[PDB]
Amino acid sequence: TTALVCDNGSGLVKAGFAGDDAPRAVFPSIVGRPRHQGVMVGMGQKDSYVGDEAQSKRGILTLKYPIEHGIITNWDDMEKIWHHTFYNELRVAPEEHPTLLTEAPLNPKANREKMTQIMFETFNVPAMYVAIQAVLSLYASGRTTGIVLDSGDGVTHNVPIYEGYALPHAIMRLDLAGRDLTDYLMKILTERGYSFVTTAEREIVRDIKEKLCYVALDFENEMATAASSSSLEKSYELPDGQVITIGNERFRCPETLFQPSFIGMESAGIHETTYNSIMKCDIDIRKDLYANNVLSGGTTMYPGIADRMQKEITALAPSTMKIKIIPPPERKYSVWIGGSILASLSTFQQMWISKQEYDEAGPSIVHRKCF
């Protein structure tokens, strides 16, 4: 059987086999095109680079992202990425391998139908399935009751689950993500004299965000300490040299998550979104929902985010009850681990979408047997 698991995500692709511990292939989802003259002959150079090759040669070509937020906008590039992660990296023939895919909540209906058409016609898989990322995030921890806040690169969403029953009317989705956090860091870095406008310099800003930024417990006196002392500065070396210095911008970019007014959005922070989600459920299940808060996703690995979230949540909730946040040591690959666990149970082998059913019903069979 040897089912396959693929996590498209947005900006990172994780693929592997079912029943393992960690994904076997991780690489960015980027497609590049040459930009310049192109003198000389005999080079035999390709017309498009996908994966780590574009990262290696990013100085002469332009980076483009097919996936954005949640909806896929470039289907030719997506077919290029799937061909690369099927023939070049995993080295497998998808003709005899069922696959499992993930999808964010509250997405256009045509996205699922087109994904099913492409997989069932271009690649000719025998079976396939689509599951929600945040539901799979609860399988990894081996739990049954809690509220999951899954923040990635495209969109952060919330969904409460109580003893194996979901509440579809208490699901909140917010666009704010790490891509807008990188853009904000790029914008506020210009006030010190550094200019980053090229699409190849967005990886430099992203790496700075991934290595230096952190979340402060309190903002007023942390800004006061950074305003007075110079003990909060670190140095970064650019690829060509010309080292730079970072001051109070170090802890200002991640703060946008709790105060989304820095970009111009009117929505509340993630602490108020998860409090409204808790208060949207039933009265007698809130006690169990408060003590089983789970964190997952790449954008949640800022230092001190668990303590800041705890401080604001207990600042809003009544003082009688107890509040805890579960930050597992692994928080990147929780979705993939849950998908691997789900794709191995003996009871799941009956919900595959066979090709006979697809042939008889058409692309509309997805809304029937999925969610």
Ligand X SMILES: Nc1ncnc2c1ncn2[C@@H]1O[C@H](COP(=O)(O)OP(=O)(O)O)[C@@H](O)[C@H]1O
Strand partners, 15: 6, 25
Strand partners, 149: 158, 295
Total binding residues toward Mg ion, as defined by CB under 5 A = 2
Q: Does 299 bind ligand X (CB under 6 A)?
A: yes
Cα torsion angle, 95, 48, 13, 19, sign: positive
Binding mask 173-212 for ligand X (x = CB under 6 A): -----x---------------------------x---x--
Per the structure block, which two tokens stand in for 112?
């699922």
Q: How far is the CB of 356 from ligand X (least distance, A)?
A: 32
Q: Spell out the SS3 assignment of 88-147.
A: HCCCCCHHHCCEEEEECCCCCHHHHHHHHHHHHHHHCCCEEEEEEHHHHHHHHCCCCCEE
Among 105, 297, 338, 339, binds ligand X (CB under 6 A): 297
Stretch that binds Mg ion, among 9-17, 45-53, 253-261, 264-272 (CB under 5 A): 9-17
Assess 10 for contact with ligand X (CB under 6 A): yes
Q: What's phi and psi for 238, nearest 5 deg?
A: -70, 160
Q: Which is nearer to Mg ion, 9 or 66 (CB)?
A: 9
Q: Cα torsion at 64, 68, 72, 77 (round to 10°)?
A: 10
103 or 222: whose CB is closer to ligand X?
103
Interaction between residue 11 and ligand X (CB under 6 A): yes
The torsion angle over the Cα atoms of residues 198, 202, 205 and 206, rounded to 10 degrees, is 180
- Residue 9 near Mg ion by CB under 5 A: yes
| DSSP structural state of residue 343 | T
Cite the DSSP H helix spans in the chain: 52-56, 75-83, 109-118, 133-140, 178-189, 202-212, 220-228, 270-279, 286-290, 305-316, 334-342, 355-361, 365-368
* Segment contacting ligand X by CB under 6 A, of 7-15, 218-226, 239-247, 304-312: 7-15
The two tokens of residue 258 are 């709790």
Stretch of residues binding a copy of itself (CB under 8 A), selected from 82-90, 93-101, 280-288, 325-333: 280-288
Which of the choices a copy of itself, ligand X, Mg ion, none does residue 114 contact, using the CB cut-off of 5 to 8 A by kind?
none
Give the Cα separation of 86 and 4 in Å (integer): 10
**Does residue 62 belong to the site contacting a copy of itself (CB under 8 A)?**
yes
Among the listed ranges 2-10, 137-145, 266-274, 317-325, the one in contact with Mg ion (CB under 5 A) is: 2-10
Site for ligand X (CB under 6 A): which residue of 227, 301, 315, 316? Answer: 301
Q: Report how far residue 127's alpha carbon sits from residue 114's, in angstroms, rounded to the nearest whole number.
A: 15
Specify the residue, 24 or 367, whose C-beta has the smaller distance to a copy of itself. Answer: 367
Bridge pairing between strands 165-166 and 172-174: unpaired
| Stretch binding ligand X (CB under 6 A), from 88-96, 197-205, 223-231, 298-306 | 298-306
Which of positions 46-75 make contact with ligand X (CB under 6 A)?
A: none
CB 325 within 8 A of CB 304: no
236 is a site residue for a copy of itself (CB under 8 A)? no
Restricted to residues 330-359, the positions that interact with a copy of itself (CB under 8 A) are 342, 345, 347-348, 351
Q: Is 152 in the site for Mg ion (CB under 5 A)?
A: yes
Q: Is residue 9 within the footprint of ligand X (CB under 6 A)?
A: yes
Options 2, 225, 267, 276; binder of a copy of itself; rule CB under 8 A: 267
Note the residues at the interface with Mg ion (CB under 5 A). 9, 152
Note the residues at the interface with ligand X (CB under 6 A). 7, 9-12, 152-154, 178, 206, 210, 297-299, 301, 332
